[PDB]
Swiss-Prot record:
Lineage: Eukaryota, Viridiplantae, Streptophyta, Embryophyta, Tracheophyta
Quaternary structure and interacting proteins, as annotated: Interacts with NAP1;1 and TCP8. Able to bind mitochondrial RNA in vitro. Component of the mitochondrial ribosome small subunit.
Organism whose genome encodes this protein: Arabidopsis thaliana
Subcellular location(s) per record: Mitochondrion matrix; Nucleus
Keyword Signal set for record: no
Keyword Glycoprotein recorded: no
Protein name (database record): Small ribosomal subunit protein mL104 (rPPR9)
Keywords (A to Z) from UniProt: Mitochondrion, Nucleus, Repeat, Ribonucleoprotein, Ribosomal protein, RNA-binding, Transcription, Transcription regulation, Transit peptide, Translation regulation
Function: RNA-binding protein that functions in both mitochondrion and nucleus. In mitochondrion, it is associated with polysomes and may play a role in translation. Required during embryogenesis. In nucleus, might be involved in the regulation of its own gene expression.
Family: Belongs to the PPR family. P subfamily.
Main location: mitochondrion
Length: 366
RNA sequence: UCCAUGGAUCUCCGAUCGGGAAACCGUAUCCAAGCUCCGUGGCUAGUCUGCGCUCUUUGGACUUUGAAAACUUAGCGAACU
């Protein structure tokens, strides 16, 4: 589209000529597509040209444009200039220095970790905009992204020193950072911290909603501790929770990784029989086929492969351009072509690529 | 219990990676190709699409050292008597 014409403008004079034909002739710039222009600059890194076009148009309709522009400035990574452009946002009127603009830049910066600049700007302009409970919760998430758990706990003990109070999402973020640092500095230092953060939820009365169980399982699967995780998914009953896409996919994983093919199958079907799995993925099948193609488990691989065929979904070439590849890397004892008969000739509909499968693993097992 | 076969573990010096006051004290690389793991870039988010790491294990080539009684064949070569 016009966006894929802007992309081959690997050059700013190109955008000069094209914007001349757009605003003055094509009448497209006469729209928020100023957003797409300044974002072209925001990936060109030339936020100077970004502000050039901002100053050019300068019509007061740049809501989406200015919020995407700050999204640029934060990913292109200059928070100092980002706050500068907040003041410039006042002076440019495309936004309003209001609760909504502020509570949007908060989520613009809370996805990278620049909570220092963010907190300074919010705790200065909360002389005109105090009530920002969105920001109130989000700063904990931003500082969790920055992982500076001292600054996390300081935001906590300070929000306690105000009209604000701590919430479930805050404790989820805190536990995210806690278990991340635990499993990435000492695994056995993870064991006590989970309670040392859940009891916080408890004394705040916080409900341990299924997001928290997502947190537990997702920070227990990277640690090859999945028996505790499966048993937690069992005990999902006590608190007013239930499964989710996260939990079911991640408990199919890390149940494969630990030689539990049987329960793996069972729990795929339990995902579907809980009903959230009306779309597992076009990809997850290939994923935990990479799993059990890594561990030399092609037998149960073809097993779950007929299972996904009976699910019906069509595995793209993605599976086939590597399955016989694994079957023929499976040649320290060579079962290669006796199952080449089963999947290389097959793939009837994409038969040229299905035969193409041969020279690749042949070039690996020359 | 027990026999035979074949498998499991199998501490140390002698010693042979370095030190050593014998039985004790210190410690892999390079390169391919493997899922996991951990951030990185993509902004074009498209199997959302791709890079580069690690600990490890395989499987190689680098990475490397062996002893005895008499017998034999040699090199030396004596005095007592």
């Amino acid at each position: 589209l016009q966006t894929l014409n802007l992309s081959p403008e690997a050059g700013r004079a190109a955008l000069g000529f094209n914007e001349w034909l757009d605003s003055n002739s094509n009448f497209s710039h006469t729209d928020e597509t100023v957003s797409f222009f300044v974002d072209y600059f925001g990936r060109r890194k030339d936020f100077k040209g970004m502000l050039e076009i901002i100053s050019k148009y300068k019509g007061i309709a740049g809501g989406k444009t200015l919020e995407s522009a700050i999204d640029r400035l934060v990913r292109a990574g200059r928070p100092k200039q980002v706050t500068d452009f907040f003041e410039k946002m006042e002076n440019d009127y495309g936004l309003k220095r209001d609760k909504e603009s502020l509570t949007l830049v908060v989520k613009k910066l809370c996805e990278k970790g620049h909570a220092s600049i963010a907190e300074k700007m919010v705790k200065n302009t909360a002389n005109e905009i105090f009530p920002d409970e969105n920001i109130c919760d989000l700063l904990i998430s931003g500082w969790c992204i920055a992982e500076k758990l001292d600054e996390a706990t300081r935001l906590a003990g300070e929000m306690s020193r105000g009209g604000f109070e701590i919430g479930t999402k805050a404790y989820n973020m805190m536990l995210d950072c806690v278990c991340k640092l635990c499993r990435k500095k000492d695994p056995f230092k993870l064991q006590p911290e989970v309670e040392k953060v859940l009891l916080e939820m408890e004394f705040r009365g916080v409900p341990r909603n299924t997001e928290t169980f997502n947190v537990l399982i997702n920070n227990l699967c990277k640690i090859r501790r999945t028996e505790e995780a499966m048993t937690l998914f069992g005990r999902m009953g006590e608190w007013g929770c239930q499964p989710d896409a996260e939990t079911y996919l991640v408990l199919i994983r890390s149940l494969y990784q630990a030689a539990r093919i049987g329960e793996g199958d069972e729990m795929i079907d339990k995902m579907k029989s809980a009903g959230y799995g009306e779309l597992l993925n076009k990809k997850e099948y290939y994923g935990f086929l990479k799993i059990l193609c890594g561990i030399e488990r092609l037998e149960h691989a073809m097993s779950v492969f007929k299972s996904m065929k009976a699910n019906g979904c069509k595995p793209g070439i993605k599976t086939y351009d590597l399955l016989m590849g694994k079957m023929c890397a499976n040649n320290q004892l060579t079962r290669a072509n006796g199952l080449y008969k089963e999947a290389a000739k097959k793939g009837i509909a994409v038969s040229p690529k299905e035969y193409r499968v041969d020279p690749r693993f042949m070039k690996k097992k020359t």
